[PDB]
């Protein structure tokens, strides 16, 4: 499968080199190859998979937003022909393909083999995120279903995280941050977004006293993102 002939450990090593070189497309292709070896991923390997695809899809989303804004201004205007729409559609189809690829890795077979809370929550958060990126560009018959798929993945991850992880766990925090962004941006539920961000921040605050200095730094960095959104939204 392009990477089928490369050793798992060599794909992991090359994904780390690609990260250092800021070659995120290559990094994602190496990590897809590693997942397709069929073994579960370690904590560090899950992080490499997520960093790779978030950077690839992040560049696509930024480009889609530039193009979408030009297309909307063109629809306010001298008719420039079909090119702005065509090129926005090109970038959109590419973005959808990357999201479908990640969702396919999660469904075949990362989630079903993930039994520990840390891995299962991590993958379900990714599933919510990539359906959220699909929802950002969705306009047709399936838009509500894409939004519900994001909601359902985030909700399952939240339910496990609240039962199995402390309120300062960084994955639990990042999940709550992203589900709160889903509520605000995608589900048109700003009050739910604000409530979730506040409750997550406050419950983490109350558990910081249990942490080492390094864990404190990890948790407080994500708490600051929650507070930055609360400042933006209130």
């Amino acid at each position: 499968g392009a990477m089928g002939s490369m050793e798992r450990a060599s794909l992991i090593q090359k994904a780390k080199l690609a990260e250092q070189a800021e070659r995120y497309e290559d990094m994602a292709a190496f990590m897809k190859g590693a997942v397709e070896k069929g073994e579960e991923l370690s904590c560090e390997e899950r992080n490499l998979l997520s960093v790779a695809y978030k950077n690839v899809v992040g560049g696509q989303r930024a480009a889609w937003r530039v193009l979408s804004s030009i297309e909307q201004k063109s629809n306010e205007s001298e008719e420039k022909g079909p090119e702005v729409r065509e090129y926005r559609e090109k970038v959109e189809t590419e973005l959808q393909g990357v999201c479908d690829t990640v969702l396919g890795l999660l469904d075949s077979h990362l989630i079903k083999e993930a039994g520990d809370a840390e891995s299962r929550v991590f993958y379900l958060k990714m599933k919510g995120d990539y359906y959220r990126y699909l929802a950002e560009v969705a306009t047709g018959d399936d838009k509500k279903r894409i939004i519900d798929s994001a909601r359902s993945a985030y909700q399952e991850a939240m339910d496990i995280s609240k039962k199995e992880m402390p309120p300062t766990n960084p994955i639990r925090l990042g999940l709550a941050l992203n589900f709160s962004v889903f509520h605000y941006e995608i589900a048109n539920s700003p009050e739910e977004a604000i409530s979730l961000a506040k409750t997550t921040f406050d419950e983490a605050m109350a558990d910081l006293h249990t942490l080492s200095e390094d864990s404190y730094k990890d948790s407080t960095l994500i708490m600051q993102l929650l507070r930055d959104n609360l400042t933006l939204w209130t």
Binding site: V51, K54, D129, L177, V181, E185, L225, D228, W233
Partner: peptide
């Protein structure tokens, strides 16, 4: 105006 989702330090 766009909010922060999780990102690397």
């Amino acid at each position: 105006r766009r909010p922060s989702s999780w990102r690397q330090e």
